[PDB]
């Protein structure tokens with residue numbers, strides 16, 4: 001038993017809800033919240049901008065030191081950093097950005113990072129401003145992640161479409 005509430009169960013291990021991931025993190029304080037990161041951990045907009053704003057820019061400060069020490073992530077890769085006031089940990093995962101021409105097959109590799117964590121609160125990777133088809137992202141999530149994932153979909157219209165079209 002865990003504290004996630006109001007989710008629709010899609011599969012044995014995947015759950016979905018129309019929610020703001022920032023507000024969901026602040027209420028659940030999950031062990032892991034996933035950020036829709038880029039390789040530079042520049043948290044400007046989308047999910048990343050919103051999570052970082054909710055940390056009063058502490059996520060960005062921590063991220064800049066991480067990059068200064070380690071260099072950029074790989075597309076499809078991840079790193080674990082602090083969850084600040086939102087979660088114990090933040091798993092920063094880089095899905096391919098279609099608006100940069102990145103290979104969409106890297107979406108499966110990106111979701112594989114979720115399997116290193118028993119339970120996660122997450123957005124759909126490569127959705128929103130990363131330009132991928134969210135229906136496809138949900139399919140890859142279901143077919144790749146084996147651990148327990150709670151997906152927050154900000155937009156109510158998209159949430160309903162994701163549920164209604166789910167196979």
Ligand SMILES: Cc1oc(=O)oc1CSc1ncnc2[nH]cnc12
Pocket residue numbers: 019020021022035036037045046047048049050123124127128129130152153154155
């Ligand atoms: C736009 C975007 O940018 C990013 O990096 O990921 C996403 C995923 S959609 C999203 N955008 C904002 N708040 C949310 N809460 C739950 N899903 C979302």
